[PDB]
Design a protein around this ligand. Structure first.
Ligand SMILES: [Zn+2]
Length: 91
């Protein structure tokens, strides 16, 4: 990305956890597949669908493992909170 990316968390304690170097972490866009995963992604940020996706992005630091696939929802703190993940129906 060319623009200084700000994630859409109500309180990103991760880019603030760093001091001058946010690791330039992979800024994830909210998945659209599956749809229920996209829906779940809004839960982490406490946002709605008309209030998300456009500008809102998510730091890879909001994941236990830093990996977004198709069943991984962001969390406020993987080291404290409950990493929200889902079991996507196989095919
Ligand atoms: Zn963040």
């Amino acid at each position: 990305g060319s623009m200084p990316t700000t994630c859409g968390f109500p309180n990103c304690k991760f880019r603030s956890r760093y001091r001058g170097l946010e690791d330039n972490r992979h800024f994830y866009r909210i998945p659209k597949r599956p749809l229920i995963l996209r829906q779940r992604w809004l839960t982490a940020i406490g946002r709605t669908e008309e209030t998300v996706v456009s500008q809102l992005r998510i730091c890879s630091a909001h994941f236990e493992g830093g990996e977004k696939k198709e069943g991984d929802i962001p969390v406020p703190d993987p080291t404290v909170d409950k990493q929200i993940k889902i079991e996507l129906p196989p095919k």
